[PDB]
Ligand SMILES: *[C@@H]1O[C@H](CO)[C@@H](O)[C@H](O)[C@H]1NC(C)=O
Ligand SMILES: *[C@@H]1O[C@H](CO)[C@@H](O)[C@H](O)[C@H]1NC(C)=O
Ligand SMILES: *[C@@H]1O[C@H](CO)[C@@H](O)[C@H](O)[C@H]1NC(C)=O
Ligand SMILES: *[C@@H]1O[C@H](CO)[C@@H](O)[C@H](O)[C@H]1NC(C)=O
Ligand SMILES: *[C@@H]1O[C@H](CO)[C@@H](O)[C@H](O)[C@H]1NC(C)=O
């Protein structure tokens with residue numbers, strides 16, 4: 021549990037868990053690459069405890085547009101759903117307020133790790149974005165396809181100067 | 182005309198003109214966007 | 230510092246220690262100004278790259294016809310038209326898109342009179358029992374003759390060669 | 405593309421210090437502009453990947469009978485017998501490149517590795533079964549020994565030079581593909597140009613962590629001791645040097661990241677152009693798509709980049 | 719290409735004075751970053767040529 | 768959650784998007800000296 025700990029000094033904040041590091045008898049506390057106290061020997065019982073910082077992360081608000089609706093979804097980035105209606109777990113984080121829908125649509129609002137969100141039209145849904153429509157070509161070693169007509173396309177390209 | 186003004190310690194330099202904005206009676210200053218002092222009242226004769 | 234307005238600093242405090250406050254404010258504002266100019270240099274480099282691209286697009290799309298595959302719009306480039314914009318340019322790319330494709334049977338060569346024939350331009354296509362030379366990207370079948378076909382070898386080295394007649398244009402009128 | 409980084413400004417500059425957070429609000433739009441810059445960089449990385457790989461419209465598939473006139477594409481075509489449906493060469497590429505710490509977090513990319521692999525597979529299937537026709541309109545299908553004839557015509561060599569040497573030509577191609585993998589296995593630093601950015605990013609981030617230990621002229625780099633052993637008149641002034649120093653280091657990091665992202669954007673624009681001319685067509689541009697007269701090209705995915713296999717005539 | 723420049727931190731920021739150098743070590747890894755950036759620029763110039 | 772986004776962007780409207788509004792942060796919660804020989 022997130023506690024304010026003090027072990028012969030070493031004042032800090034975090035959660036203390038049992039560890040398996042092999043401290044030499046003269047060593048009191050450990051330090052990670054980047055110099056962050058990662059472990060500590062408690063003076064009383066001489067046990068080795070790992071220190072893990074309390075859960076933190078960013079909060080993103082997925083909005084379908086104020087003019088459309090006032091519903092929102094909340095994404096907690098890099099946070100497990102084991103901590104703080106619908107709750108869904110993604111490689112991006114914990115998504116609350118969005119019902120996962122297992123039909124693939126084009127990406128409307130990028131959540132991450134291949135998962136997007138959109139206003140169902142009614143509620144905000146989360147889905148796995150689709151790359152496109154499968155079209156196997158009829159490959160054969162003696163068949164060709166030749167176009168019998170054409171169209172003329174006028175594309176528009178904007179370039180800042 | 183460009184003139185130094187010292188309104189009870191409010192020191193500045195500028196051109197003072199007959200104001201056309203409606204300060205409510207509880208307002209003694211005027212701010213534009215980005216907090217630029219756009220209008221001021223005289224602490225003596227109460228002129229905007 | 231004590232305040233962001235210089236009047237309070239200069240009035241309430243004498244110059245000796247007000248100098249430190251003024252120096253702190255000046256350093257902060259110089260830091261913000263330098264940050265602004267560095268960001269502007271980065272953004273101007275980005276805009277310069279965009280303007281070089283737009284100049285290349287004017288040169289190669291508007292003053293010519295481009296063979297680069299997706300440079301001057303999607304499709305086979307026909308032409309392009311410039312239009313002015315507030316801080317940029319808009320290119321109208323006129324391109325040619327094939328449509329209404331049909332299936333056919335092909336053969337890399339035609340074995341006639343014991344020798345292989347390959348098309349000068351176009352492909353050999355068939356609709357069943359009939360073979361035609363057509364251009365690559367528009368269906369326009371023509372009869373196979375020696376004017377559109379080039380002989381190159383015997384017809385026992387090409388994999389997939391079919392055998393069909395190749396009309397000789399000089400045969401009927403001269404004989 | 406780069407790694408999508410993010411920084412919680414407070415926790416880096418303050419940490420567990422409440423007084424530091426109270427003081428930091430005086431500066432205002434510093435953390436806002438840093439967050440906007442990093443968010444722009446991340447969105448730009450996703451855009452780079454999207455522009456390079458998502459050119460194809462439909463998701464094409466290759467026929468079950470994988471006979472293409474003697475040309476063997478097994479080393480570039482995906483292998484279904486693996487959890488990741490990546491090709492034999494792409495697996496070597498991912499194996500050869502080896503890839504919540506006090507405010508510095510890394511955002512996952514929008515496109516997963518399997519999605520980029522599926523895009524690459526669609527590009528390969530379209531190139532093999534349609535030629536260059538799938539990038540300029542409807543995907544018209546032609547026999548592969550006839551794409552090669554068209555491309556020989558493209559480099560100025562007649563059609564029959566293919567048909568009279570087809571088997572030989574096929575074998576040459578196959579052998580080259582084989583040697584390619586050995587080359588990738590031989591020189592460890594062959595993909596160094598693709599590892600460097602990774603290393604570079606780590607280096608920058610490492611420096612940032614190191615900058616959290618510097619005193620910046622203060623009595624110590626730990627906020628707790630400064631707040632405990634000192635009176636407010638000097639403590640708050642001592643902290644001001646630790647906030648100014650940390651803000652300067654963070655701004656330096658953001659500016660360096662902006663320059664690096666500009667470089668990566670230029671590289672991604674080049675990669676998209678290579679995908680357009682080299683892969684979706686045949687390039688008359690002299691040295692753009694490999695040494696020798698360009699015949700064709702094949703894309704392969706890599707952890708933060710693209711690998712082009714340029715088949716050329718010498 | 720452009721000119722390849724190398725910079726010595728101590729002789730710029732501090733000069734001959736022995737005492738200030740003694741103060742300079744407390745700032746950490748600024749000069750490592752600076753020298754690494756300049757070496758990267760120089761190697762880039764050679765690669766351009 | 769929406770209001771806070773509105774407050775951050777300094778606008779009463781939010782267009783469609785993912786907007787980063789705040790940070791979530793779980794919270795925290797002998798040799799005795801010989802006086803006996805003298806006294
Ligand atoms: C809704 O309002 C937004 C601005 O809040 C505007 O951009 C959009 O065009 C509006 N749409 C409709 C359908 O009114
Ligand atoms: C997240 O929480 C779940 C509990 O449902 C657990 O199984 C999983 O291992 C956790 N993730 C990590 C990375 O520990
Ligand atoms: C929808 O697909 C998901 C994929 O994870 C699956 O878990 C779920 O059971 C499916 N639901 C229905 C109704 O098919
Ligand atoms: C060409 O043949 C394939 C396979 O027989 C078929 O799927 C496709 O629709 C055909 N196209 C046309 C235009 O007939
Ligand atoms: C093939 O086309 C030719 C000319 O268009 C026509 O004379 C012939 O009847 C066609 N044959 C078949 C089987 O469609």
Ligand SMILES: *[C@@H]1O[C@H](CO)[C@@H](O)[C@H](O)[C@H]1NC(C)=O
Pocket residue numbers: 161162388389469471
């Ligand atoms: C096409 O391939 C099939 C099987 O792969 C083979 O039987 C047939 O002879 C081939 N045809 C040509 C023209 O190569």
Ligand SMILES: *[C@@H]1O[C@H](CO)[C@@H](O)[C@H](O)[C@H]1NC(C)=O
Pocket residue numbers: 476477478479582
């Ligand atoms: C293609 O090459 C691989 C590797 O040498 C080989 O194992 C495979 O048999 C070849 N494929 C075919 C269809 O011959």
